[PDB]
């Protein structure tokens, strides 16, 4: 499986997924919330 957001450059998942602190990309609480490196986010 492989990074995201700040362990790979930015990008994140084709889907309007977000990426979590330690480059997993995917949508949660602590994806799409203060936790997100980059992606679909809400804040």
């Given at each position: 499986?492989?990074?995201?957001?700040?362990?790979?450059?930015?990008?994140?998942?084709?889907?309007?997924?977000?990426?979590?602190?330690?480059?997993?990309?995917?949508i949660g609480?602590?994806?799409?919330?203060?936790?997100?490196?980059?992606?679909?986010?809400?804040?």
């Amino acid at each position: 499986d492989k990074p995201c957001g700040k362990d790979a450059g930015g990008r994140v998942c084709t889907n309007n997924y977000c990426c979590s602190k330690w480059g997993s990309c995917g949508i949660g609480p602590g994806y799409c919330g203060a936790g997100c490196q980059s992606g679909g986010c809400d804040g």
